[PDB]
Scaffold this active site. Structure first.
Site, PDB file in Angstrom:
ATOM      1  N   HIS A  62       0.833  -1.193   0.000  1.00 58.78           N
ATOM      2  CA  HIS A  62       0.000   0.000   0.000  1.00 58.78           C
ATOM      3  C   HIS A  62       0.879   1.258   0.000  1.00 58.78           C
ATOM      4  CE1 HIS A  62      -3.238  -2.819   0.719  1.00 58.78           C
ATOM      5  NE2 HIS A  62      -2.717  -3.148   1.923  1.00 58.78           N
ATOM      6  N   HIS A  92       4.823   7.194   7.130  1.00 62.08           N
ATOM      7  CA  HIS A  92       4.585   6.749   5.769  1.00 62.08           C
ATOM      8  C   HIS A  92       4.220   7.990   4.948  1.00 62.08           C
ATOM      9  CE1 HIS A  92       0.656   6.571   7.618  1.00 62.08           C
ATOM     10  NE2 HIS A  92       0.226   7.016   6.399  1.00 62.08           N
ATOM     11  N   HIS A  94       1.806   9.322   1.342  1.00 61.08           N
ATOM     12  CA  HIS A  94       0.849   9.114   0.300  1.00 61.08           C
ATOM     13  C   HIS A  94       1.291   9.994  -0.866  1.00 61.08           C
ATOM     14  CE1 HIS A  94      -2.063   7.324   3.225  1.00 61.08           C
ATOM     15  NE2 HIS A  94      -1.379   8.075   4.044  1.00 61.08           N
ATOM     16  N   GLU A 104      -3.589  13.594   0.698  1.00 61.14           N
ATOM     17  CA  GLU A 104      -4.933  13.153   1.215  1.00 61.14           C
ATOM     18  C   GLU A 104      -5.745  14.367   1.641  1.00 61.14           C
ATOM     19  OE1 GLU A 104      -4.191   9.762   3.835  1.00 61.14           O
ATOM     20  OE2 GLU A 104      -4.882   8.586   2.074  1.00 61.14           O
ATOM     21  N   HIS A 117       2.775  11.309   6.906  1.00 62.34           N
ATOM     22  CA  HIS A 117       2.030  11.023   8.105  1.00 62.34           C
ATOM     23  C   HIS A 117       2.975  10.440   9.142  1.00 62.34           C
ATOM     24  CE1 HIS A 117      -1.937  10.787   5.680  1.00 62.34           C
ATOM     25  NE2 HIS A 117      -1.536  12.061   5.933  1.00 62.34           N
ATOM     26  N   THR A 196      -6.731   6.734   7.388  1.00 57.97           N
ATOM     27  CA  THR A 196      -7.111   6.943   6.005  1.00 57.97           C
ATOM     28  C   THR A 196      -6.993   5.666   5.167  1.00 57.97           C
ATOM     29  OG1 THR A 196      -5.005   7.696   5.198  1.00 57.97           O
ATOM     30  CG2 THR A 196      -6.540   9.365   6.107  1.00 57.97           C
ATOM     31  N   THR A 197      -6.560   4.576   5.788  1.00 61.94           N
ATOM     32  CA  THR A 197      -6.639   3.255   5.204  1.00 61.94           C
ATOM     33  C   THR A 197      -7.448   2.338   6.090  1.00 61.94           C
ATOM     34  OG1 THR A 197      -4.666   2.479   6.316  1.00 61.94           O
ATOM     35  CG2 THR A 197      -4.386   3.438   4.138  1.00 61.94           C
TER      36      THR A 197
HETATM   37 NI    NI Z   1      -1.486   7.940   6.116  1.00 61.43          NI
END
Ligand code: NI
Ligand code: NI
Length: 258
Positions: A62, A92, A94, A104, A117, A196-197
Site C-alpha cells: 500500500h 509513511h 501518500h 490526502e 504522516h 485513512t486506510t
Molecule cells: Ni497515512
C-alpha cells in the site's frame, strides 16, 4: 490484502468491508482555510524527536512504513490540541502518479504532490494496538510535499526504496532522523478524524502543518518506482495511494495561527 487504490478495490469500495468508511469523523478532509477558526486556547505544539530510533522499512503493498522502536519514552508529540503525550511509532507517505495530485488532505481544494504522516499513539493506552480502539488514541502529524528543491533529510529514505521494491519486502533502517522531514514552521490546523486506510478507525487527532516541505522531482519519481504487487505477479507501480477528501459532517477545523 484485497483492498487497494484501483477501480475495483479502491476507496469507493472500502465501506463494504469497513462500514465506518461512511462515518461521522472520516479522514482526510478539505481544509477550508477561511472557515477554520483561530483558537487562542490551543497550547504550543511540542515535537521532541531528539531520541527517535528507527528500526526497519517495509513495503506493505500500500505504502512503505518506516517503523520506530517505541518501547521507551522517546520521540514524543504533545501540546497543541493534545492532552497527555503521544509516542512516535511509524511514518509513511501518500503520493500521486503525477505532481498535481497525491496528498490526502487538501487546502482550499489544492492537492499537493504527496503527504507525510507521522503516527503517534497516546501513552495512556500502553501500546498502539489498544490506542487505535480509543477515540483519542492517535495523533498524526501531516506534512504536505511540493515538488521543487530537494529535501536532503529525505534522501536516506529515497536511497533504500530499491531494496523494498515489492509487497512484503523489508529492510533494516536505523539512525533515520525524522526531524529532517519537518518544515520550519509548526503552524497547524487540527480536527478529529480517522485512519485513512482500512480499518478506517475514528481514533485520530489530526495535526496538519500549514507549511509544506519541498522535495525534488527525482525524489518523488523514486517513490513512484515502488510496486504494489508482490514479486512474481505483474508489475503495478505504487502510485495514487491516497484516499480523497471525505465529508466534514459539521466537525470544526481549528487553526493554531491568526
Ligand atoms: Ni497515512
Ligand atoms: Ni484484503
Amino acid at each position: 490484502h484485497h483492498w487497494g487504490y484501483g477501480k475495483h478495490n479502491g476507496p469507493e469500495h472500502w465501506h463494504k468491508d469497513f462500514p465506518i468508511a461512511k462515518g461521522e469523523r472520516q479522514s482526510p478532509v478539505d481544509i477550508d482555510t477561511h472557515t477554520a477558526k483561530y483558537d487562542p486556547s490551543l497550547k504550543p505544539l511540542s515535537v521532541s524527536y531528539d531520541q527517535a530510533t528507527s528500526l526497519r522499512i517495509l513495503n506493505n503493498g500500500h505504502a512503505f512504513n518506516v517503523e520506530f522502536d517505541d518501547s521507551q519514552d522517546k520521540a514524543v508529540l504533545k501540546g497543541g490540541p493534545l492532552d497527555g503525550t503521544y509516542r512516535l511509532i511509524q511514518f509513511h507517505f501518500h503520493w500521486g502518479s503525477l505532481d498535481g495530485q497525491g496528498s490526502e488532505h487538501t487546502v482550499d481544494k489544492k492537492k499537493y504532490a504527496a503527504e507525510l504522516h507521522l503516527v503517534h499513539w497516546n501513552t495512556k493506552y500502553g501500546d498502539f494496538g489498544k490506542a487505535v480502539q480509543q477515540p483519542d488514541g492517535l495523533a498524526v502529524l501531516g506534512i504536505f510535499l511540493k515538488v521543487g528543491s530537494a529535501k536532503p533529510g529525505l534522501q536516506k529514505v529515497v536511497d533504500v526504496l530499491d531494496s523494498i521494491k515489492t509487497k512484503g519486502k523489508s529492510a533494516d533502517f536505523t539512525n533515520f532522523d525524522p526531524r529532517g522531514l519537518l518544515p520550519e514552521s509548526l503552524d497547524y490546523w487540527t480536527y478529529p478524524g480517522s485512519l485513512t486506510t482500512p480499518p478506517l478507525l475514528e481514533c485520530v487527532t489530526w495535526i496538519v502543518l500549514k507549511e509544506p516541505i519541498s522535495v525534488s522531482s527525482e525524489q518523488v519519481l523514486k517513490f513512484r518506482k515502488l510496486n504494489f504487487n508482490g514479486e512474481g505477479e505483474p508489475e503495478e507501480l505504487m502510485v495514487d495511494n491516497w484516499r480523497p477528501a471525505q465529508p466534514l459532517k459539521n466537525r470544526q477545523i481549528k487553526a493554531s495561527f491568526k
